[PDB]
């Protein structure tokens, strides 16, 4: 009864512009198209990562507990395991 959708990195890479702004962080896939102007760190750092694995950039910032919880509402799925960063 889990209802997780699994994506490949090629599928994520198709969603690579500000109007379909997806990225991967720690093997979770997020669609932040509706978050761009709500992000305290601005929209450009997020548009720069559209279609990519943004894990290292996200971690370099050291986001807070509240930012980590806020992210969950933008999760749309997870990477297929064979492409995961382990």
Total H helices, total E strands in the chain = 4, 5
What CA–CA distance (Å, rounded) separates 63 from 19? 24
What CA–CA distance (Å, rounded) separates 73 from 30? 9
Q: Tell which residue, 70, 20, 1, has the closest CA to residue 11.
A: 20
Query: Interface with ligand HEM includes 41 (CB under 6 A)?
Result: yes
39 is in an annotated binding site: yes
Query: Interface with ligand HEM includes 47 (CB under 6 A)?
Result: no
Query: Interface with ligand HEM includes 40 (CB under 6 A)?
Result: yes
63 is in an annotated binding site: yes
List, as residue ranges, the binding site.
39, 63
Q: Which residues bind ligand HEM (CB under 6 A)?
A: 23, 30, 32, 35, 39-41, 45-46, 49, 54, 57-58, 61, 63-64, 66-67, 70-71, 74
């Amino acid at each position: 009864s889990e209802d997780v959708k699994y994506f490949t990195r090629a599928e994520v890479a198709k969603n690579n512009t500000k109007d379909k702004n997806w990225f991967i962080i720690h093997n979770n896939v997020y669609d932040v198209t509706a978050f761009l102007n709500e992000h305290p760190g601005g929209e450009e750092v997020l548009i720069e990562q559209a279609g990519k694995d943004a894990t290292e950039h996200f971690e370099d910032v050291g986001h807070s507990s509240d930012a980590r919880e806020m992210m969950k509402q933008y999760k749309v799925g997870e990477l297929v395991a064979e492409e995961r960063s382990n």
